[PDB]
């Protein structure tokens, strides 16, 4: 019942002109997908990108999540979450840890991959488009407790934990190539993405239509705004509140017939919404960075 957490990827480059990376490890004499264990304090996406780079030499942008693999190891259970990862370049160099890397079309990769569960992940990869754009919907970080007053507490700030969540989110949102920033009209939403804003040197666009009060008064306007943001070029981060996110995510998944594999709505959590030709093809719920 102890889980060793890991992550990795189907690393790909230019549906069926695509080539994917398969690695060989001398220690096990295996052919598999690049992946590795999370370091203390890392989230799965951050670890996937790091391990891809360490094992293949490539940087990449993570897209759609492609499922979970588990198997027994002496310490308990190895758990690996996999992403589609588009190469943004690099060069492999053989070493003692990974001695070969082959770029293969999917059919040939299917034969090269020795583990059934890697083949399962690769089947998931080909099931939907992988050249995706990404919308990142983030519930703001922890911000103490609502006051006894009516409504919201417009200026209530992140607490110490929440400020740490905000800092931890930078690496997680960068893993997906976030480029533009949007926050509902509450201090705690802006503060969650301020560290990212500082990192990108971008301003945060204020969104009065996406607050809890606004969604409860005019949900259609909130939905319309979400779609307007998502249609703009780049990969937007939109930080908003707990009474808003589940309704927006459910409505989009329903209209697009997308089934999320995981669900939740925790403060500091992220939904990764993958779009292909402006249609939703994936909705992946990530835990807060300091939670499992
Ligand atoms: N890469 C990989 N290895 C697996 C899978 N299933 C499975 O039994 N193995 C075996 O699990 C054992 C431990 O390998 P591992 O790759 O999980 O562990 P690791 O800590 O050395 O590497 P990591 O840092 O990449 O997680 C190896 O004997 C390997 O053959 C799988 O789906 N993928
Ligand atoms: N190197 C290696 N390859 C294995 C194994 N099992 C296993 O099924 N294979 C498959 O055998 C083929 C590669 O053989 P080599 O060229 O000898 O590395 C690939 O289809 C692998 O998926 C194994 O333990 N080692
Ligand atoms: Mg590894």
DSSP per-residue codes, 215-233: HHH-HHHHHHHHHHHHHSS
Token pair of 137, please?
A: 């919907």
**Are 158 and 139 in contact, with CB atoms under 8 Å apart?**
no
Q: Please tell me the distance from the alpha carbon of residue 130 to that of residue 11, in angstroms, as a whole number.
A: 11
DSSP state of 68: E
Domain termination residue (choose one: 106, 130, 154): 130
- Judge if 57 and 140 occupy the same domain: no
- Judge if 167 and 268 occupy the same domain: yes
- Judge if 226 and 147 occupy the same domain: yes
**Residue range of the domain that includes 67:** 1-130
CB atoms within 10 A of CB 273: 29
Report how far apart, in Å, the C-alpha atoms of 89 and of each of 14, 64, 69, 86, 232 are. Answer: 11, 19, 27, 9, 26
- Judge if 106 and 201 occupy the same domain: no
Cα 47 versus chain centre, distance = 11
**Are 20 and 134 in contact, with CB atoms under 8 Å apart?**
no
Domain termination residue (choose one: 130, 159, 184): 130
- Judge if 164 and 114 occupy the same domain: no
Q: Please tell me the distance from the alpha carbon of residue 122 to that of residue 253, in angstroms, as a whole number.
A: 23
- Judge if 104 and 126 occupy the same domain: yes
- Judge if 126 and 153 occupy the same domain: no
**Are 38 and 69 in contact, with CB atoms under 8 Å apart?**
no
Resolution (Å) of this entry: 1.6
Domain termination residue (choose one: 130, 165, 181): 130
- Judge if 214 and 155 occupy the same domain: yes
- Judge if 24 and 107 occupy the same domain: yes
**Measured from the CA of 111, which atom of ligand 2 is nearest?**
20
- Judge if 60 and 197 occupy the same domain: no
Q: Which residues contact 100 (CB under 8 A, 6 or more apart)?
A: 23, 24, 94
Instruction: Give the chain's domain count.
Output: 2
- Judge if 55 and 117 occupy the same domain: yes
**Measured from the CA of 78, which atom of ligand 1 is nearest?**
17
Token pair of 291, please?
A: 């939670």
DSSP state of 105: E
Q: Which residue puts its alpha carbon closest to atom 30 of ligand 1?
A: 28
**Are 7 and 48 in contact, with CB atoms under 8 Å apart?**
yes
The ligand 1 site (C-beta within 6 Å) comprises 6, 28, 30, 32, 35-37, 69, 71, 73, 78, 115, 117-118
* Residue of 107, 113, 114, 118 best suited for mutating to test ligand 2, as the one with most atoms within 8 Å of CB: 114
- Judge if 163 and 286 occupy the same domain: yes
**Measured in angstroms, how far is the CA atom of residue 23 from the centroid of ligand 3?**
10
DSSP state of 209: G
């Amino acid at each position: 019942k102890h889980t060793v957490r890991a992550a990795g990827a189907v690393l790909w480059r230019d549906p069926a002109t695509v080539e994917v990376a398969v690695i060989h490890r001398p220690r096990y004499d295996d052919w598999s997908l690049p992946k590795g264990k999370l370091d203390q304090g890392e989230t799965e996406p951050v670890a996937a990108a790091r391990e891809i780079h360490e094992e293949t030499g490539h940087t990449a942008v993570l897209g759609r999540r492609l499922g979970r693999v588990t198997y027994p190891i002496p310490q308990g259970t190895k758990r690996v979450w996999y992403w589609a990862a588009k190469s943004t370049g690099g060069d492999f160099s053989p070493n003692d840890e990974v001695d070969k890397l082959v770029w293969l079309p999917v059919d040939a990769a299917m034969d090269q991959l020795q583990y059934p569960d890697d083949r399962k992940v690769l089947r998931r990869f080909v099931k939907r488009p992988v050249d995706t754009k990404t919308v990142l919907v983030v519930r703001h970080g922890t911000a103490g407790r609502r006051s006894r007053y009516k409504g919201d507490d417009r200026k209530r700030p992140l607490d110490k934990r929440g400020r740490a969540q905000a800092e931890a989110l930078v690496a997680q949102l960068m893993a997906f190539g976030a480029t533009t920033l949007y926050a509902a009209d509450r201090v705690r939403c802006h503060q969650t993405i301020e560290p990212l804003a500082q990192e990108l040197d971008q301003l945060i666009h204020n969104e009065p239509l996406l607050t809890e009060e606004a969604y409860a008064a005019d949900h259609k306007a909130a939905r319309k705004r979400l779609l307007e943001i998502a249609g703009r070029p780049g990969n937007p981060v939109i930080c908003t509140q707990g009474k808003v996110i589940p309704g927006l995510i459910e409505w989009w998944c329903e209209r697009a017939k997308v089934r999320p594999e995981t669900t939740g709505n925790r403060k500091g959590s992220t939904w990764v919404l993958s779009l292909s030709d402006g249609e939703l093809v994936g909705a992946d719920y990530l835990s807060p960075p300091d939670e499992k």
